[PDB]
Amino acid sequence: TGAVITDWRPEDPAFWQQRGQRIASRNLWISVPCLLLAFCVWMLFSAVAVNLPKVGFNFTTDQLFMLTALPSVSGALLRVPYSFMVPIFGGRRWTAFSTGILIIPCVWLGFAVQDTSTPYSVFIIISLLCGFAGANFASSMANISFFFPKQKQGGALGLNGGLGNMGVSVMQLVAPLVVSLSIFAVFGSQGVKQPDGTELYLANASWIWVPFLAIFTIAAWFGMNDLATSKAKRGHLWIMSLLYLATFGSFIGFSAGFAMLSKTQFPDVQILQYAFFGPFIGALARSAGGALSDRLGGTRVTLVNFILMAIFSGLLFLTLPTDGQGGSFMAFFAVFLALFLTAGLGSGSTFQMISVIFRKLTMDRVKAEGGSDERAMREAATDTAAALGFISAIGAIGGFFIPKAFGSSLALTGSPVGAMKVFLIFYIACVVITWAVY
Ligand SMILES: CCCCCCCC/C=C\CCCCCCCC(=O)OC[C@H](O)CO
Ligand SMILES: CCCCCCCC/C=C\CCCCCCCC(=O)O
């Protein structure tokens, strides 16, 4: 029952009832909180950048948007490499490592926000380091696919990735709470007197994850396992890439720059009180998207969803001050909730299609070729790990594009309309292209 498992036989019904299920279950429920904490670290600047002017920093609006968009750059670049790391180092060893190193940017960001002389380029580095957390998805999903290789075990991936995405809302909920409280005075936390008369501890938004990162690094080390087992069309790979970019990329893109966008359009509103609700119902709808796609088919769900994305991205224009005249935060917030909801739905819907193409179809193609059940699970798991690594990497681009588009549109034109036009054309194009592959 040691950490390294040399006897792994999922092709044996007896092994699974005796050893297999209990092992795979233990790994999943340590993988989920580790992945959840990664999504907390990944999107940290979505909440931190908003509070940066409140503590003395004078970065431009575009600079603040850039800080929220950059972790999706290093995240996208590292997801394909991360997808190959579990077979090399083992699920347990890599999970402990990929979670443990996330302590460094968290500690650093806490000290950076307490010094107003901290260069913007330092925040750039920290922002890029937070992107390492975003790459944890590809490794975490790859790991689960090996622990749950059987045909009926499809869903352990959706659960791991679904609960992982919850980390965005968790962080956007926890961060505004802890910054009002003084809890790390022992470690050198300094408060900044707000115009409200209250105190603001921006370091807490980052330092709060350090103990939890430490705990589940130890938990992954003593609780997870290393599978000592062998782990050996492109047209579909690009369609899924485009689909996952339009859906998940929208989800993670809106999650990164919503609070910043809301702050530029409605300065009076403390958006961090409600911002977490967006990614929350988005990650929640992700689970509904998979079952909906399985029932109604990937084509019908993707088509209708993209229609709604275009419509809701179109309604977003009506909720904006034009210029300094009118506008409705309530409508602005509600429409974005509709955009978060439809992005998460399509995210889970697209993900369900990925597993159908690269896991189930693969596992059944080898069987039809007379292949064993062991080889069936193996190829399906590795092909899924490799595909999802590529697909999620392309999908992460939206996490950079959307906030950067807003910042560029606001700087060049003094309005977010320019970025929203591009989004609308994109969604309309997605409707057309999805209708092309039909
Ligand atoms: C906090 C600064 C950044 C930290 C970056 C960490 C780098 C990740 C490398 C290994 C992770 C697992 C480390 C092992 C976890 C501790 C295990 C331990 O406490 O003891 C093990 C026992 O002695 C023997 O079985
Ligand atoms: C396989 C691709 C791996 C990508 C690794 C991404 C991690 C990069 C981390 C930071 C490196 C420093 C970036 C340079 C900052 C420039 C600051 C500036 O120009 O203003």
GROMACS .gro file of C-alpha atoms and ligand atoms in nm:
model
  483
    1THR     CA    1   0.000   0.000   0.000
    2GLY     CA    2   0.301   0.227  -0.052
    3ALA     CA    3   0.302   0.555  -0.244
    4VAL     CA    4   0.431   0.396  -0.565
    5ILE     CA    5   0.186   0.142  -0.707
    6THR     CA    6   0.346  -0.140  -0.905
    7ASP     CA    7   0.030  -0.352  -0.917
    8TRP     CA    8  -0.229  -0.162  -1.120
    9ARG     CA    9  -0.479  -0.382  -1.304
   10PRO     CA   10  -0.796  -0.191  -1.399
   11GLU     CA   11  -0.862  -0.459  -1.663
   12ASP     CA   12  -0.931  -0.692  -1.370
   13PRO     CA   13  -1.285  -0.662  -1.225
   14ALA     CA   14  -1.169  -0.822  -0.899
   15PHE     CA   15  -0.877  -0.580  -0.855
   16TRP     CA   16  -1.103  -0.277  -0.885
   17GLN     CA   17  -1.358  -0.392  -0.628
   18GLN     CA   18  -1.077  -0.489  -0.391
   19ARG     CA   19  -0.811  -0.222  -0.444
   20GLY     CA   20  -0.875  -0.011  -0.754
   21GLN     CA   21  -1.180   0.192  -0.654
   22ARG     CA   22  -1.049   0.291  -0.310
   23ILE     CA   23  -0.717   0.404  -0.458
   24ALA     CA   24  -0.864   0.604  -0.746
   25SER     CA   25  -1.117   0.764  -0.511
   26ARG     CA   26  -0.849   0.879  -0.267
   27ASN     CA   27  -0.644   1.040  -0.544
   28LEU     CA   28  -0.944   1.223  -0.690
   29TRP     CA   29  -1.040   1.390  -0.362
   30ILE     CA   30  -0.688   1.522  -0.310
   31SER     CA   31  -0.659   1.621  -0.675
   32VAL     CA   32  -0.975   1.833  -0.657
   33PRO     CA   33  -0.867   2.065  -0.374
   34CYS     CA   34  -0.517   2.091  -0.522
   35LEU     CA   35  -0.663   2.192  -0.858
   36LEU     CA   36  -0.911   2.426  -0.691
   37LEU     CA   37  -0.626   2.607  -0.515
   38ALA     CA   38  -0.450   2.635  -0.851
   39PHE     CA   39  -0.745   2.823  -1.000
   40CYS     CA   40  -0.730   3.052  -0.697
   41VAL     CA   41  -0.365   3.139  -0.763
   42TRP     CA   42  -0.415   3.155  -1.140
   43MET     CA   43  -0.679   3.429  -1.134
   44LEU     CA   44  -0.542   3.616  -0.830
   45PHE     CA   45  -0.483   3.941  -1.021
   46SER     CA   46  -0.851   3.954  -1.118
   47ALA     CA   47  -0.913   4.074  -0.762
   48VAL     CA   48  -0.573   4.215  -0.664
   49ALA     CA   49  -0.535   4.458  -0.956
   50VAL     CA   50  -0.864   4.625  -0.858
   51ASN     CA   51  -0.731   4.700  -0.510
   52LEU     CA   52  -0.390   4.820  -0.631
   53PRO     CA   53  -0.494   5.185  -0.668
   54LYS     CA   54  -0.651   5.166  -0.321
   55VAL     CA   55  -0.309   5.104  -0.163
   56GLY     CA   56  -0.108   5.370  -0.345
   57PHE     CA   57  -0.014   5.221  -0.683
   58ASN     CA   58  -0.069   5.442  -0.988
   59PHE     CA   59  -0.066   5.203  -1.283
   60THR     CA   60  -0.271   5.287  -1.593
   61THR     CA   61  -0.602   5.112  -1.662
   62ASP     CA   62  -0.441   4.916  -1.944
   63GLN     CA   63  -0.154   4.817  -1.716
   64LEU     CA   64  -0.401   4.682  -1.461
   65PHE     CA   65  -0.584   4.488  -1.732
   66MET     CA   66  -0.251   4.347  -1.852
   67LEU     CA   67  -0.181   4.209  -1.505
   68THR     CA   68  -0.505   4.008  -1.520
   69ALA     CA   69  -0.440   3.884  -1.874
   70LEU     CA   70  -0.075   3.776  -1.851
   71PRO     CA   71  -0.118   3.466  -1.632
   72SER     CA   72  -0.319   3.313  -1.917
   73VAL     CA   73  -0.016   3.360  -2.143
   74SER     CA   74   0.225   3.156  -1.931
   75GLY     CA   75  -0.063   2.924  -1.845
   76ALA     CA   76  -0.134   2.845  -2.209
   77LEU     CA   77   0.236   2.798  -2.287
   78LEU     CA   78   0.283   2.551  -2.002
   79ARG     CA   79  -0.028   2.333  -2.039
   80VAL     CA   80   0.111   2.116  -2.320
   81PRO     CA   81   0.437   2.060  -2.127
   82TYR     CA   82   0.243   1.995  -1.804
   83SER     CA   83   0.036   1.729  -1.980
   84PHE     CA   84   0.354   1.524  -2.025
   85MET     CA   85   0.480   1.566  -1.668
   86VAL     CA   86   0.264   1.311  -1.483
   87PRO     CA   87   0.387   1.013  -1.689
   88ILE     CA   88   0.745   1.124  -1.618
   89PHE     CA   89   0.739   1.211  -1.247
   90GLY     CA   90   0.420   1.041  -1.131
   91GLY     CA   91   0.082   1.181  -1.032
   92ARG     CA   92   0.164   1.216  -0.663
   93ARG     CA   93   0.513   1.364  -0.706
   94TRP     CA   94   0.407   1.616  -0.968
   95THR     CA   95   0.090   1.722  -0.787
   96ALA     CA   96   0.298   1.793  -0.477
   97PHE     CA   97   0.552   1.984  -0.686
   98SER     CA   98   0.311   2.180  -0.906
   99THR     CA   99   0.112   2.284  -0.598
  100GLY     CA  100   0.411   2.355  -0.375
  101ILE     CA  101   0.586   2.599  -0.608
  102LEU     CA  102   0.271   2.814  -0.612
  103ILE     CA  103   0.366   2.932  -0.264
  104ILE     CA  104   0.648   3.143  -0.410
  105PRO     CA  105   0.430   3.380  -0.617
  106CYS     CA  106   0.180   3.405  -0.330
  107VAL     CA  107   0.445   3.510  -0.078
  108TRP     CA  108   0.604   3.747  -0.330
  109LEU     CA  109   0.278   3.920  -0.427
  110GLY     CA  110   0.206   3.987  -0.060
  111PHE     CA  111   0.531   4.179  -0.018
  112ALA     CA  112   0.498   4.351  -0.356
  113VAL     CA  113   0.162   4.513  -0.279
  114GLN     CA  114   0.295   4.655   0.049
  115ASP     CA  115   0.564   4.857  -0.128
  116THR     CA  116   0.438   5.139  -0.351
  117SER     CA  117   0.786   5.165  -0.502
  118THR     CA  118   0.749   4.815  -0.646
  119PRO     CA  119   0.814   4.832  -1.024
  120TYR     CA  120   0.535   4.739  -1.266
  121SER     CA  121   0.769   4.487  -1.428
  122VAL     CA  122   0.795   4.305  -1.095
  123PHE     CA  123   0.418   4.268  -1.103
  124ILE     CA  124   0.462   4.140  -1.459
  125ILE     CA  125   0.690   3.861  -1.337
  126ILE     CA  126   0.456   3.772  -1.050
  127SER     CA  127   0.166   3.777  -1.296
  128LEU     CA  128   0.350   3.533  -1.522
  129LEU     CA  129   0.436   3.311  -1.225
  130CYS     CA  130   0.068   3.291  -1.129
  131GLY     CA  131   0.019   3.137  -1.473
  132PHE     CA  132   0.204   2.824  -1.360
  133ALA     CA  133  -0.105   2.754  -1.152
  134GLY     CA  134  -0.314   2.757  -1.469
  135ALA     CA  135  -0.101   2.481  -1.619
  136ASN     CA  136  -0.193   2.254  -1.328
  137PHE     CA  137  -0.518   2.175  -1.509
  138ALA     CA  138  -0.347   1.979  -1.788
  139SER     CA  139  -0.144   1.774  -1.540
  140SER     CA  140  -0.435   1.719  -1.300
  141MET     CA  141  -0.667   1.604  -1.577
  142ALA     CA  142  -0.395   1.379  -1.722
  143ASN     CA  143  -0.347   1.218  -1.381
  144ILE     CA  144  -0.716   1.143  -1.326
  145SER     CA  145  -0.753   0.984  -1.671
  146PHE     CA  146  -0.503   0.716  -1.567
  147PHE     CA  147  -0.663   0.652  -1.227
  148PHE     CA  148  -1.003   0.625  -1.394
  149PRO     CA  149  -0.925   0.446  -1.723
  150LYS     CA  150  -1.234   0.223  -1.753
  151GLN     CA  151  -1.515   0.304  -1.997
  152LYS     CA  152  -1.784   0.367  -1.734
  153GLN     CA  153  -1.550   0.594  -1.537
  154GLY     CA  154  -1.608   0.889  -1.768
  155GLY     CA  155  -1.717   1.170  -1.539
  156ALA     CA  156  -1.431   1.159  -1.290
  157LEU     CA  157  -1.261   1.399  -1.531
  158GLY     CA  158  -1.564   1.627  -1.548
  159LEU     CA  159  -1.584   1.624  -1.169
  160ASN     CA  160  -1.215   1.703  -1.125
  161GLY     CA  161  -1.216   1.978  -1.387
  162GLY     CA  162  -1.557   2.106  -1.282
  163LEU     CA  163  -1.473   2.145  -0.914
  164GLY     CA  164  -1.134   2.280  -1.020
  165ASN     CA  165  -1.297   2.570  -1.202
  166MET     CA  166  -1.474   2.657  -0.876
  167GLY     CA  167  -1.143   2.795  -0.750
  168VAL     CA  168  -1.199   3.113  -0.949
  169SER     CA  169  -1.517   3.199  -0.759
  170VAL     CA  170  -1.368   3.077  -0.431
  171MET     CA  171  -1.076   3.319  -0.461
  172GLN     CA  172  -1.296   3.607  -0.581
  173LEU     CA  173  -1.512   3.548  -0.272
  174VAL     CA  174  -1.239   3.491  -0.012
  175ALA     CA  175  -1.005   3.772  -0.120
  176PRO     CA  176  -1.241   4.066  -0.059
  177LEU     CA  177  -1.323   3.922   0.284
  178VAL     CA  178  -0.971   3.865   0.417
  179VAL     CA  179  -0.828   4.201   0.306
  180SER     CA  180  -1.060   4.380   0.549
  181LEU     CA  181  -0.931   4.165   0.835
  182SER     CA  182  -0.592   4.176   1.009
  183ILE     CA  183  -0.467   3.818   1.038
  184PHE     CA  184  -0.104   3.812   0.925
  185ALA     CA  185   0.035   4.090   1.145
  186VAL     CA  186   0.284   3.836   1.280
  187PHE     CA  187   0.442   3.780   0.938
  188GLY     CA  188   0.467   4.150   0.858
  189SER     CA  189   0.131   4.249   0.712
  190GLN     CA  190   0.070   4.624   0.690
  191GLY     CA  191  -0.269   4.793   0.658
  192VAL     CA  192  -0.348   5.095   0.442
  193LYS     CA  193  -0.604   5.341   0.579
  194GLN     CA  194  -0.886   5.366   0.324
  195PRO     CA  195  -1.091   5.682   0.257
  196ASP     CA  196  -1.375   5.486   0.419
  197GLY     CA  197  -1.178   5.500   0.743
  198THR     CA  198  -1.143   5.122   0.726
  199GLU     CA  199  -0.819   4.926   0.689
  200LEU     CA  200  -0.704   4.740   0.378
  201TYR     CA  201  -0.460   4.448   0.388
  202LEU     CA  202  -0.399   4.363   0.023
  203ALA     CA  203  -0.129   4.110   0.114
  204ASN     CA  204  -0.398   3.890   0.269
  205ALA     CA  205  -0.557   3.831  -0.072
  206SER     CA  206  -0.239   3.648  -0.169
  207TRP     CA  207  -0.102   3.516   0.160
  208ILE     CA  208  -0.428   3.341   0.253
  209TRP     CA  209  -0.353   3.061   0.006
  210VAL     CA  210  -0.003   2.989   0.139
  211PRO     CA  211  -0.117   2.774   0.433
  212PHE     CA  212  -0.371   2.584   0.222
  213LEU     CA  213  -0.114   2.530  -0.053
  214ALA     CA  214   0.121   2.393   0.212
  215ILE     CA  215  -0.142   2.164   0.364
  216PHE     CA  216  -0.251   1.998   0.039
  217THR     CA  217   0.109   1.968  -0.079
  218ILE     CA  218   0.166   1.752   0.228
  219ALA     CA  219  -0.170   1.584   0.167
  220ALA     CA  220  -0.081   1.504  -0.194
  221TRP     CA  221   0.256   1.367  -0.083
  222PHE     CA  222   0.123   1.128   0.183
  223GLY     CA  223  -0.218   1.064   0.029
  224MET     CA  224  -0.180   1.033  -0.348
  225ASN     CA  225  -0.003   0.765  -0.551
  226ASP     CA  226   0.244   0.720  -0.836
  227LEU     CA  227   0.126   0.477  -1.103
  228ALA     CA  228   0.427   0.273  -1.212
  229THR     CA  229   0.257   0.168  -1.537
  230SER     CA  230   0.324   0.216  -1.909
  231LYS     CA  231   0.161   0.523  -2.062
  232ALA     CA  232   0.201   0.495  -2.440
  233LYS     CA  233  -0.769   1.303  -3.602
  234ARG     CA  234  -0.592   1.639  -3.594
  235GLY     CA  235  -0.892   1.791  -3.770
  236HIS     CA  236  -1.100   1.724  -3.461
  237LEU     CA  237  -0.815   1.859  -3.248
  238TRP     CA  238  -0.850   2.205  -3.403
  239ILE     CA  239  -1.230   2.213  -3.396
  240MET     CA  240  -1.224   2.126  -3.026
  241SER     CA  241  -0.951   2.387  -2.978
  242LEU     CA  242  -1.166   2.656  -3.138
  243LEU     CA  243  -1.473   2.543  -2.943
  244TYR     CA  244  -1.288   2.534  -2.611
  245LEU     CA  245  -1.144   2.879  -2.681
  246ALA     CA  246  -1.486   3.026  -2.754
  247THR     CA  247  -1.635   2.871  -2.440
  248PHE     CA  248  -1.381   2.815  -2.162
  249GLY     CA  249  -1.163   3.096  -2.294
  250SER     CA  250  -1.462   3.325  -2.263
  251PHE     CA  251  -1.527   3.195  -1.911
  252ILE     CA  252  -1.170   3.245  -1.792
  253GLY     CA  253  -1.138   3.566  -1.994
  254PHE     CA  254  -1.446   3.722  -1.840
  255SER     CA  255  -1.340   3.597  -1.496
  256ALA     CA  256  -1.010   3.784  -1.525
  257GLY     CA  257  -1.135   4.122  -1.644
  258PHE     CA  258  -1.496   4.159  -1.530
  259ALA     CA  259  -1.418   4.338  -1.203
  260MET     CA  260  -1.173   4.569  -1.381
  261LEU     CA  261  -1.424   4.641  -1.658
  262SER     CA  262  -1.702   4.708  -1.408
  263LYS     CA  263  -1.472   4.945  -1.220
  264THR     CA  264  -1.412   5.157  -1.531
  265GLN     CA  265  -1.780   5.170  -1.627
  266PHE     CA  266  -1.933   5.198  -1.280
  267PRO     CA  267  -1.669   5.349  -1.046
  268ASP     CA  268  -1.905   5.387  -0.749
  269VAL     CA  269  -1.995   5.018  -0.734
  270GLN     CA  270  -1.781   4.792  -0.517
  271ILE     CA  271  -1.781   4.511  -0.773
  272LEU     CA  272  -1.572   4.273  -0.560
  273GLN     CA  273  -1.881   4.221  -0.344
  274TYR     CA  274  -2.065   4.049  -0.630
  275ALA     CA  275  -1.798   3.960  -0.887
  276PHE     CA  276  -1.746   3.607  -0.753
  277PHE     CA  277  -2.101   3.512  -0.853
  278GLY     CA  278  -2.007   3.519  -1.221
  279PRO     CA  279  -1.744   3.241  -1.228
  280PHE     CA  280  -1.951   3.056  -0.966
  281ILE     CA  281  -2.257   2.992  -1.183
  282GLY     CA  282  -2.018   2.948  -1.475
  283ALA     CA  283  -1.832   2.662  -1.310
  284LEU     CA  284  -2.166   2.532  -1.187
  285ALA     CA  285  -2.319   2.531  -1.535
  286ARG     CA  286  -2.011   2.346  -1.663
  287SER     CA  287  -2.141   2.023  -1.509
  288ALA     CA  288  -2.482   2.078  -1.669
  289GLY     CA  289  -2.322   2.126  -2.010
  290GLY     CA  290  -2.173   1.778  -2.025
  291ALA     CA  291  -2.497   1.597  -1.947
  292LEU     CA  292  -2.686   1.828  -2.183
  293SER     CA  293  -2.443   1.756  -2.467
  294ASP     CA  294  -2.459   1.381  -2.400
  295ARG     CA  295  -2.839   1.393  -2.420
  296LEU     CA  296  -2.903   1.632  -2.710
  297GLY     CA  297  -2.577   1.592  -2.901
  298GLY     CA  298  -2.271   1.815  -2.927
  299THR     CA  299  -2.396   1.991  -3.240
  300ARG     CA  300  -2.732   2.115  -3.111
  301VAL     CA  301  -2.599   2.232  -2.774
  302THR     CA  302  -2.296   2.411  -2.920
  303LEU     CA  303  -2.509   2.583  -3.184
  304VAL     CA  304  -2.776   2.710  -2.944
  305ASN     CA  305  -2.513   2.812  -2.688
  306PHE     CA  306  -2.312   3.018  -2.938
  307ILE     CA  307  -2.638   3.184  -3.045
  308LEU     CA  308  -2.700   3.288  -2.684
  309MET     CA  309  -2.341   3.411  -2.649
  310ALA     CA  310  -2.386   3.636  -2.952
  311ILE     CA  311  -2.722   3.763  -2.823
  312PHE     CA  312  -2.600   3.831  -2.469
  313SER     CA  313  -2.280   3.992  -2.595
  314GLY     CA  314  -2.508   4.208  -2.808
  315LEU     CA  315  -2.733   4.308  -2.519
  316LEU     CA  316  -2.422   4.418  -2.329
  317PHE     CA  317  -2.407   4.736  -2.539
  318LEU     CA  318  -2.739   4.859  -2.400
  319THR     CA  319  -2.613   4.849  -2.041
  320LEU     CA  320  -2.321   5.088  -2.096
  321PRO     CA  321  -2.289   5.462  -2.021
  322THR     CA  322  -2.262   5.642  -2.356
  323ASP     CA  323  -2.095   5.846  -2.254
  324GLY     CA  324  -2.130   5.927  -1.886
  325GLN     CA  325  -2.499   5.926  -1.973
  326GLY     CA  326  -2.719   5.658  -1.820
  327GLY     CA  327  -2.614   5.295  -1.820
  328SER     CA  328  -2.737   5.028  -1.580
  329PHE     CA  329  -2.510   4.829  -1.350
  330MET     CA  330  -2.796   4.593  -1.265
  331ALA     CA  331  -2.848   4.515  -1.633
  332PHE     CA  332  -2.471   4.514  -1.692
  333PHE     CA  333  -2.423   4.263  -1.411
  334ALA     CA  334  -2.718   4.045  -1.513
  335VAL     CA  335  -2.606   4.023  -1.877
  336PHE     CA  336  -2.256   3.922  -1.770
  337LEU     CA  337  -2.410   3.653  -1.550
  338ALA     CA  338  -2.584   3.530  -1.865
  339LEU     CA  339  -2.246   3.538  -2.039
  340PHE     CA  340  -2.076   3.354  -1.753
  341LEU     CA  341  -2.358   3.098  -1.752
  342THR     CA  342  -2.347   3.033  -2.127
  343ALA     CA  343  -1.966   3.021  -2.129
  344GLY     CA  344  -1.957   2.756  -1.857
  345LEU     CA  345  -2.232   2.558  -2.027
  346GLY     CA  346  -2.038   2.548  -2.353
  347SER     CA  347  -1.721   2.472  -2.159
  348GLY     CA  348  -1.867   2.152  -2.016
  349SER     CA  349  -2.040   2.075  -2.344
  350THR     CA  350  -1.715   2.107  -2.538
  351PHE     CA  351  -1.530   1.903  -2.276
  352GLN     CA  352  -1.782   1.621  -2.308
  353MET     CA  353  -1.716   1.616  -2.682
  354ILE     CA  354  -1.340   1.595  -2.621
  355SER     CA  355  -1.379   1.282  -2.407
  356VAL     CA  356  -1.613   1.128  -2.664
  357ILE     CA  357  -1.364   1.182  -2.947
  358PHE     CA  358  -1.032   1.109  -2.776
  359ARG     CA  359  -1.123   0.874  -2.490
  360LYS     CA  360  -1.436   0.670  -2.563
  361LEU     CA  361  -1.394   0.651  -2.941
  362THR     CA  362  -1.026   0.566  -2.898
  363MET     CA  363  -1.096   0.297  -2.636
  364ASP     CA  364  -1.353   0.137  -2.866
  365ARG     CA  365  -1.151   0.167  -3.187
  366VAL     CA  366  -0.876  -0.053  -3.043
  367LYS     CA  367  -1.129  -0.307  -2.917
  368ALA     CA  368  -1.279  -0.328  -3.265
  369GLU     CA  369  -0.924  -0.396  -3.386
  370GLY     CA  370  -0.904  -0.692  -3.150
  371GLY     CA  371  -0.699  -0.511  -2.888
  372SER     CA  372  -0.698  -0.603  -2.519
  373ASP     CA  373  -0.886  -0.413  -2.250
  374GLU     CA  374  -0.557  -0.307  -2.091
  375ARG     CA  375  -0.426  -0.153  -2.413
  376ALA     CA  376  -0.767   0.004  -2.469
  377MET     CA  377  -0.756   0.196  -2.141
  378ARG     CA  378  -0.392   0.290  -2.197
  379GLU     CA  379  -0.421   0.450  -2.541
  380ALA     CA  380  -0.747   0.624  -2.451
  381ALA     CA  381  -0.597   0.774  -2.135
  382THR     CA  382  -0.278   0.898  -2.301
  383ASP     CA  383  -0.456   1.027  -2.612
  384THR     CA  384  -0.695   1.215  -2.384
  385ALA     CA  385  -0.409   1.355  -2.175
  386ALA     CA  386  -0.226   1.471  -2.487
  387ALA     CA  387  -0.534   1.611  -2.661
  388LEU     CA  388  -0.669   1.793  -2.355
  389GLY     CA  389  -0.322   1.938  -2.299
  390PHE     CA  390  -0.323   2.090  -2.647
  391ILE     CA  391  -0.691   2.190  -2.642
  392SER     CA  392  -0.685   2.354  -2.299
  393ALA     CA  393  -0.368   2.538  -2.400
  394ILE     CA  394  -0.541   2.695  -2.700
  395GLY     CA  395  -0.844   2.759  -2.481
  396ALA     CA  396  -0.642   2.957  -2.227
  397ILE     CA  397  -0.569   3.222  -2.492
  398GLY     CA  398  -0.911   3.372  -2.422
  399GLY     CA  399  -0.796   3.445  -2.068
  400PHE     CA  400  -0.546   3.691  -2.215
  401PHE     CA  401  -0.731   3.819  -2.520
  402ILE     CA  402  -1.050   3.937  -2.347
  403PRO     CA  403  -0.893   4.146  -2.069
  404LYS     CA  404  -0.629   4.280  -2.308
  405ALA     CA  405  -0.899   4.368  -2.560
  406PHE     CA  406  -1.087   4.567  -2.296
  407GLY     CA  407  -0.773   4.751  -2.186
  408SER     CA  408  -0.678   4.834  -2.544
  409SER     CA  409  -1.033   4.941  -2.633
  410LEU     CA  410  -1.056   5.163  -2.324
  411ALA     CA  411  -0.717   5.322  -2.386
  412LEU     CA  412  -0.759   5.385  -2.759
  413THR     CA  413  -1.127   5.484  -2.767
  414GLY     CA  414  -1.224   5.555  -2.407
  415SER     CA  415  -1.492   5.288  -2.440
  416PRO     CA  416  -1.521   4.908  -2.403
  417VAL     CA  417  -1.740   4.895  -2.715
  418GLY     CA  418  -1.445   4.826  -2.945
  419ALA     CA  419  -1.357   4.507  -2.760
  420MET     CA  420  -1.722   4.403  -2.746
  421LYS     CA  421  -1.762   4.439  -3.122
  422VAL     CA  422  -1.475   4.195  -3.174
  423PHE     CA  423  -1.634   3.952  -2.928
  424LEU     CA  424  -1.970   3.970  -3.106
  425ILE     CA  425  -1.816   3.906  -3.449
  426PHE     CA  426  -1.625   3.616  -3.295
  427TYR     CA  427  -1.941   3.458  -3.148
  428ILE     CA  428  -2.134   3.509  -3.472
  429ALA     CA  429  -1.843   3.348  -3.657
  430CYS     CA  430  -1.853   3.059  -3.410
  431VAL     CA  431  -2.220   3.008  -3.494
  432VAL     CA  432  -2.136   2.999  -3.865
  433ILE     CA  433  -1.830   2.774  -3.837
  434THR     CA  434  -2.016   2.534  -3.607
  435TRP     CA  435  -2.289   2.528  -3.871
  436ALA     CA  436  -2.018   2.449  -4.126
  437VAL     CA  437  -1.909   2.137  -3.938
  438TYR     CA  438  -2.263   1.999  -3.960
  439LIG     C1  439   0.752   2.685   0.030
  439LIG     C2  440   0.856   2.715  -0.072
  439LIG     C3  441   0.825   2.644  -0.199
  439LIG     C4  442   0.826   2.497  -0.177
  439LIG     C5  443   0.845   2.426  -0.307
  439LIG     C6  444   0.839   2.279  -0.285
  439LIG     C7  445   0.896   2.209  -0.404
  439LIG     C8  446   0.814   2.088  -0.433
  439LIG     C9  447   0.897   1.965  -0.417
  439LIG    C10  448   0.839   1.847  -0.346
  439LIG    C11  449   0.700   1.856  -0.292
  439LIG    C12  450   0.682   1.753  -0.186
  439LIG    C13  451   0.773   1.784  -0.072
  439LIG    C14  452   0.758   1.679   0.033
  439LIG    C15  453   0.650   1.719   0.127
  439LIG    C16  454   0.701   1.710   0.267
  439LIG    C17  455   0.714   1.567   0.305
  439LIG    C18  456   0.757   1.557   0.448
  439LIG     O1  457   0.716   1.639   0.528
  439LIG     O2  458   0.816   1.441   0.494
  439LIG    C19  459   0.818   1.328   0.415
  439LIG    C20  460   0.873   1.213   0.493
  439LIG     O3  461   0.975   1.257   0.573
  439LIG    C21  462   0.924   1.109   0.399
  439LIG     O4  463   0.826   1.013   0.379
  440LIG     C1  464   0.737   2.646  -2.253
  440LIG     C2  465   0.716   2.794  -2.224
  440LIG     C3  466   0.745   2.827  -2.078
  440LIG     C4  467   0.699   2.968  -2.043
  440LIG     C5  468   0.743   3.008  -1.903
  440LIG     C6  469   0.666   3.130  -1.855
  440LIG     C7  470   0.723   3.186  -1.725
  440LIG     C8  471   0.796   3.318  -1.747
  440LIG     C9  472   0.816   3.387  -1.614
  440LIG    C10  473   0.879   3.520  -1.610
  440LIG    C11  474   1.005   3.546  -1.689
  440LIG    C12  475   1.036   3.695  -1.689
  440LIG    C13  476   0.954   3.767  -1.795
  440LIG    C14  477   1.019   3.898  -1.835
  440LIG    C15  478   0.946   4.017  -1.774
  440LIG    C16  479   0.969   4.143  -1.857
  440LIG    C17  480   0.929   4.269  -1.781
  440LIG    C18  481   0.908   4.382  -1.879
  440LIG     O1  482   0.950   4.373  -1.997
  440LIG     O2  483   0.850   4.487  -1.845
   0.00000   0.00000   0.00000
